[model samples]
Every structure is written in C-alpha cells, then in structure tokens.
Target: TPSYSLTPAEASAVAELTLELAAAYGSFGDPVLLRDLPRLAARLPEGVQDFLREFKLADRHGHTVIRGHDFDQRRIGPTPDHWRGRVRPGPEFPEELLLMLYSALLGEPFGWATQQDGHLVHDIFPIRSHEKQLLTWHTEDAFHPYRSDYLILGALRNPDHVPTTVGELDLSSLSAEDIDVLFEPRYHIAPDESHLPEAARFATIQRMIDERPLGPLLYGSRLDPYMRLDPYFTSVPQDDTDARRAYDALFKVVDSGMREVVADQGDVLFIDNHRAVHGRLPFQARYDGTDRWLKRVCVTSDLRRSREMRATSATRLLG
Candidate 1:
C-alpha cells in the first residue's frame, strides 16, 4: 500500500488547525462547515494536499495511509456502548476534524438520510449485538448511483490492532471469456442494510426495491477498470448461467487479492471506493468501552450529480 506519514511538526500543525476549526464549526455535520469545506480544504498542510491531489489523479494502490499522530485515549473517552448519532463536540472532535480535512482534499463529504440517523460522520465500533459477525468484503453503498468516490477511516482507538481488509482487482488475471460477461449489464444490486426507518421521508428503500439498479460490475477504463461489487448485497439472477460463471471468476479474483491494513489511533486511511472493495476482520467486542473505534467520512467527487436526491445545492445528505 502507498502511504504518507506526517512529521511530528506537521502533525502538531494539524492539531492546532483542528482546534481552530472545531471552535469555529461545532461539528462536521454543520451546514456552514459543509458550505465552507472546499475553502477550508486548502488550509491543511501543503504536503498533505499535494499527496492526496496526486493520489486522486494517479493510479497506484487502491489505498493510502496518512499516519503519525499521537492521540490521548483518555481524552477521547472509552469506546461508546453503541453509536451516538450526531455526536457532539468533545475531546474526539479534533480527530473527526482531522478526518474531515483529509477527506475534503479528496472530494465533498456527504451522508445518507437513512444511515446512522442521517449523521454526516459515521462511528464504527464493535457492539455486543454484532460482536462476532465477520464483516464480509463489500463496496460501500454499492446500490446507490451517487455513492462516495473515496472514504476516510480514521481510528480513534484500536488496542487490538484489528485489521481492515481490502481487495484490489487484478484485471489482467481474469480470463478473456469471463471478462465479457462481467462487462455486460446482467447483474442486480439492492440497497444495503445500512439504511433505517427514521428517514422514511427520503423514500429510498422502496425505490431501491422497485428500480433494482442493473449494470455491469466492472466499468470505466478498459485497460484498467474500476469495480462495484458487494459479495453479500450484489446479486446475479439464478438462471443467468453465463453471468453466474463470470461472477464466480470475479469473486475468486477478489478473494485471492484481499489483504490487511491496520489503522492505529490518529491513523487515517484514504481508500478509493471505486478501485477496491473493503471490510473488517471478525473480532469479539468486550463492550467494555475499550474495543476498536473508528470514524468514517464518505467523500463524493461530484455533489451536483445527486441534486435530485438532495433538497438543496449545499445539502450533502442523499436519499
């Protein structure tokens, strides 16, 4: 994996900037913060901006790490018993702001009206209910047409050093015959389970069921294609023999390529959503408020494309 580590001085500068931004904007969900994000993005370290700028333009690994920061776990508090939707400003606010800044350099940070009570930044922590569930490999919001172009997964605490798995497709390894089937629009994808009933006003679930978005799993450049695959959520029709065969080949490739990348506290992973599918390894949650905790922000390359799903030009939440 390609990575860029911030120097101690650079990390301190970011902390100072994070403090100022946290005071100016209460939380990352603030509409004003969303409106001012693009302008604020230019304020991060020039080295960071240049690194991320090049990552977006160039083709290297599907992921990159921005490491080297020291976090006070006590200040962040124990891991939450469960996700606290719309988290208030606290000791951990600086870390969230750091993630927001890093993600802003990539694209516009946005949210879903149906997920995590419509909160802009999602909190990922191991809970008793989902303690041992192995987070299978999948794309983030594969069913949504206007999903994120990139995701920033910032770790606040990970004493266990839990690994986040990612699989970058090797196009050349696929057979010529299977490639044709994958390139055709013969597969079906439904909305993921991340949505909820509270935001029924968005009416997205029903739409997902009704429309059943159908398209080729592999698209973009022919020489180096991008992929949209959700091992559990994305489906192929039972009777579609050729599609099923092709899907098996694709699955084999993804499974074989999967690798681990650990995110320690203050470490941020900038993953290109289109280029790779990622998931978490199974770990039992102690629920003792000491489990691994991570904050994620999804960044969309073009907000204008989701105008119909959004209420206003500045609104980042999509139905």
Candidate 2:
C-alpha cells in the first residue's frame, strides 16, 4: 500500500549486485543475464526482496513503488528525442537491469513486434510534436491477447516534477444495472501510433488496425471485474445507446478517481494492468536536454500464452 525506501544496507547491497552483474556480463541486455534473472534475483537485499512479495502475491494496492536505488543520472545524458534514439547498454543499463530483475520476479518481460523497432525496453520523454497533448488513460496494448500483466516505469530525471496519472474503476460508484452491458461484447478497440510505428509494414498490426476487434469493456470475475479501456482508441456503436451509456458512466468514474504520482530519480513504479489505468498529465515541452524522462518495461503473467505470436521460443517480442 505504500512505497518503500531502501535502507542504507539495502542500497549498498544493490550497488554491489550491479557491479557483480556487469563484470560477468557485457551489458544488461545480455541473453545470459536475462535468461538467468529469476535465479539471480536471490542476490537482492533481503528487505527489498520481502517488499516485492506483496506485488508477486495478491497485491492489495494494485500498484507499487520502490525508491532510493543508486544511479548516476548525470552520466545517462539528456533524454532522447524518441524511443529508438535511446542507446542501449548505455548509462541506464543498471536501471534497466533493475526493472528487468523486478519484472522477472513477477512474470516474463515482453515487447511488441512493431513498437520501438522491437526494443524490449522503452523511453518516454516530451517529444516536440506530442508534448502538449495528454497521454490519455489506457492500459498497455488493450487490443492484444498478450497485454502486459504489469508495467514498470523507473524515473531517471524529472526537474519539472510532471506526474503520471493513474486510476482504476470504482465498481461501487457505477450503476449496478449497467454492469451487464459493460460485460457484453459491444466495445471496439484497435491499435494506434505508439504500438504501430509504421502501421503498414507489419502484417499483424495492419490486420488489427483494419479489423477492430469488438469485446467487452469489463471481464474476469463477476464479483470483481477487470477492464480494458483506451478512451482515445476505443469505440462503441453510434446507434447503441445502452452501450454508450455504460461506457460514459465508466469514463466519468475512472477519470474522477485519478491520482497524480510524481516520481523522482531512482523511483521504480510498478502498475498492475488489470486493476489500474495510467496516463500522463500534459506539461510544457522543454526541447532542451533537461526534461522529465522515464523508462518502461512490460511484464506478462504467462509468456507461453502468447507463444504462437512470438517469432521464436526464446524471444520475448510478441506479434
């Protein structure tokens, strides 16, 4: 329910682990480290390990944050212009490895085949064209069968302290009568520019773009529901008043319940995809080197479920 600040002993333990990892492996991206992460996670500080257990177990809060890890933000250089521009095995490698290590504890880490040129980790900063536009609330890859079960965002720099808005559906706040409608297969969601870099080049992405799959806004246990909503990309029938009414009610409740979380350097935020929705609060773009920046890696509960979509058994990239 609360974010954890590593103890002095814990912080030092983490630093040593990073050095131990770097010596044996060329980079954090090394297949050897990635493959052995589950086993290597044993080296984390005991307190830190215990803190992550709530998340790996039931996760009452639906989200978590671990703070006070050591990192040299100054050496990481300026935020990149785009996701692809970020150089791997760079200054952010330990930070990347940290997220991956946390990710390995929960589930398998994954990436979209068409997103960021298939890079497993992603960079988010204020690019000139989209700085002012709000990154409206949405779950990661809502249209896909293999969406992230958990998404990790670790902050590197945030001089302006821009916040990431996160919220979840309040079932009690909604009309009980509308629940059934939301559970029906009347919602249409599709891919967008973030998931589709070129859109036309990728066959599966193009297919999903052309054929918007219609499904329910809410699914899972009836007593406790799970939602897949992307307000910017989701659609409902123009003529279906019942579906529209239910969708609108959900939007209002979710929007009003949002909380702004301002992450500082060395803070790692873990968001549960099923129980929460997240977006960015629009802030002024400082085209200069100094600006708010974050790194993200996606985790899946079951990698084998998407085995058919992956190019190979060993690869984490999904179709």
Candidate 3:
C-alpha cells in the first residue's frame, strides 16, 4: 500500500488553503514564512490533518506517499543541473507552502549549513557532473547517505517517472549480541561527497580515516532504531573485530533488501530518514524544459534538539 492519498475534495481544499497562505506571505524567502507554519497548519482541513497525524505518530512502514493533487505546470520552470545560485521559493511558492504545512505535523523543519546555500527547501534533480558519481546512488560509500529525521519529496514534474529506492534496518532484525556491538561507537562517518569540494575530497576522507571516532550507527529506542550511516565515508575501528563484523552484517541485510517507490507529478513522499536509507535509480536528464523535479524539506520532531545550533526561535536554518 502507498503512504497516504488525498481525496478530490481534500486535495482541492489543500491547494486552495496553500494558495491563500502563500499570498499572505507574498515572498517564500521571508523569515516570517517559517514562523507561520504552525498557524497555517491549524487552518488545514480536518481530514488532511488526521492523515498527517497518523503518518507522523507511527509510520511503521517508514515511508508514505500522498497522491491526487494537481500542480500548476505553468508555475514551475526548467529543472536546474545543480543546487546553486538564486535559491528561493520563487514561482514554487505554492508547492513550498504545502511542504511546510505537511512537515509541521512531523516536527520543525530545518536546513543544512553545507547544502543548497542552507535554504529550508532543497531541489532534487539530476546533476550533470554527479550523474556517474555516488550522488547518483545517494552515495557510493557505505554510510554516505542522506541522514535526517524526516524527508519530504514532493514531485512537481516527472517526465520519465523515475523510481526512488528505500531500505531500512530495524532493531528487531538484529540479534542481541549484534545490536550490543553496534551500540558501541566504532563507525566514523563523514559528510556525503555532495557536501565536499572536489579538491578536498581525498584529503577529507583521509583525515576521517586517520582520525576515526566512536559513534553509534544505530541508536535510540531498542524497539525502533535511528541510524546515521554514510558507508562511503564511514570506517570501522581497526582493533575491534566484533564491532567491524557486526557493522558488516547489518549493512549486508540492508543492501540485500530495498524497495522502490515510483512517484509521479503532484505526489508527495514522506520518508523516515532515521529508520531508512534512500537513493534514486540512474536516469538520463534531458536538461531540456522537461525533467524530474522534486522539492525536498528536512524536519525534526523537536526544534529544541538543536537549540544551541540555531540563532533564534523563529529561524529554522542551522547555519
């Protein structure tokens, strides 16, 4: 079964409410935009709110998709090759507003200091230079995967309809001994290559390899596991034989079993980033007017978790 779907009436109401909110804010880049998410959320139809509540509370499947909405094709422009230059909501204001509303139900959304100029919303499309690289698979390194609490991928256009692969390793799947070994800090993880410069790539990897630190790959409730894996940049402790074996075993399980979710236009997919790993299949980007474009936002259940990292209560950026 898919994650969640909106009925015709519900979808139209959501679009109309989002349009109203976007018009009130005027510009998507305004700081006030983030502050009003919860306020606007209260105005969403009760049916939509109920669906979001169920998805956020215990999305055991780790992911869900909301389909049936219609996006304004005239509003979206060509998909860019990279996530740089002129970063703002621009014409995608309505889509961004919808993302912010849905994300509020899960938690406070934030942006990364190193990715896409630290904007709250990120665009995901095929990049020319990164097509053959780890960025294609989300990462080539074992732990080089996008790690966040919640990930919302709302499709604006998908000419070819590419499928996204997602996989998760639950605590129940592992034996007590394996889980105990994983709890030890043996995996050293670095940021994915997407966050690093070309010249510093090797140097960064070498430095992390030389200075391996202990950190849990799987942490949180025993009944549920939260992960921070970047296999491409993660290294196991040299001296700890059992820990290394345990890490390999867990990776093996995840690698062997992964599912693909094909999303079309107007479909939004919510992924539990902590519980799973996700990547896209290889696809050719026309670089023309038509391409697969999805708007992504990162969310956390509690804003206070990163209080020290944030400058103000109203801001969601972690820079």
For model 2, the stretches where C-alpha displacement exceeds 4 angstroms are 81-86, 129-135, 194-211
lDDT of all predictions: 0.82, 0.80, 0.73
Give the better candidate number (1 or 2) by TM-score. 1
Return the TM-score for each candidate structure.
Answer: 0.91, 0.90, 0.85
The alpha-carbon lDDT assigned to residue 11 of candidate 3 equals 83
Superpose all Cα atoms of candidate 1 onto the true structure and report the RMSD in Å to 1 decimal.
Answer: 2.5
The residue-by-residue lDDT of candidate 2 on 1-319, one tens digit each, is: 6789997688778867876776677764578878898888878977777778766686456578998877676767877776665556666676777777888888888897777777777778888765345558888778777789999998888888888888887889888778889999898887656543423224655556677667898988766788888888789999999999999999999889988887787788889898889987877777787888788999998998877677878888876
Q: What order do candidates take by TM-score, descending? A: 1, 2, 3
Give the best candidate by TM-score.
Answer: 1
User: How would you encode candidate 1's per-residue C-alpha lDDT over 122-219 as one tens digit per residue?
Assistant: 88987776543655898887767888889999988888899999889998889878887888899988765653443543664466677766689888
Cα RMSD of all models vs. native, in order, equals 2.5, 2.9, 4.6
Error of 2 at 295 (Å): 1.1
Q: Say which candidate scores most in lDDT.
A: 1
The residue-by-residue lDDT of candidate 3 on 67-140, one tens digit each, is 87768888666776677766565677889889988888778887866677777788887777765444322222
Residue 65's lDDT in candidate 1: 88
Backbone clashes in candidate 3 total 15
Which parts of model 1 have CA positions greater than 4 angstroms off? 85-87, 129-135, 194-208, 211-213
lDDT of 1: 0.82
